[PDB]
Amino acid sequence: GCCPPCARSPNNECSEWLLLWCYC
């Protein structure tokens, strides 16, 4: 479902792969 707030963390570039975890 909707990934935990990961992309809001500038230190955590997870936003790259996070798109597979969530898009909502």
* Residue entry with tokens 């997870």: 14
* SS3 labels along 1-24: CCCCCCCCCCCCHHHHCHHHCCCC
Amino acid at position 21, single letter = W
Sign of the alpha-carbon dihedral angle for 9, 15, 17, 23:
positive
Q: What are phi and psi of 13, to 5 degrees?
A: -55, 5
- Hey, what are 23's tokens? 């898009």
Which residue do the tokens 């909707």 mark?
2
The structure was resolved experimentally with: NMR
Residue whose C-alpha is closest to residue 14's, from 5, 1, 2: 5
CB 7 within 8 A of CB 20: no
Amino acid code (one letter) for 15:
S
What is the spatial distance between Cα 22 and Cα 19, in angstroms, rounded to a whole number? 5
Task: Give the integer Cα–Cα distance in Å for 16 and 13.
Answer: 6
The distance from CA 22 to its chain's CA centroid, rounded to whole angstroms, is 7
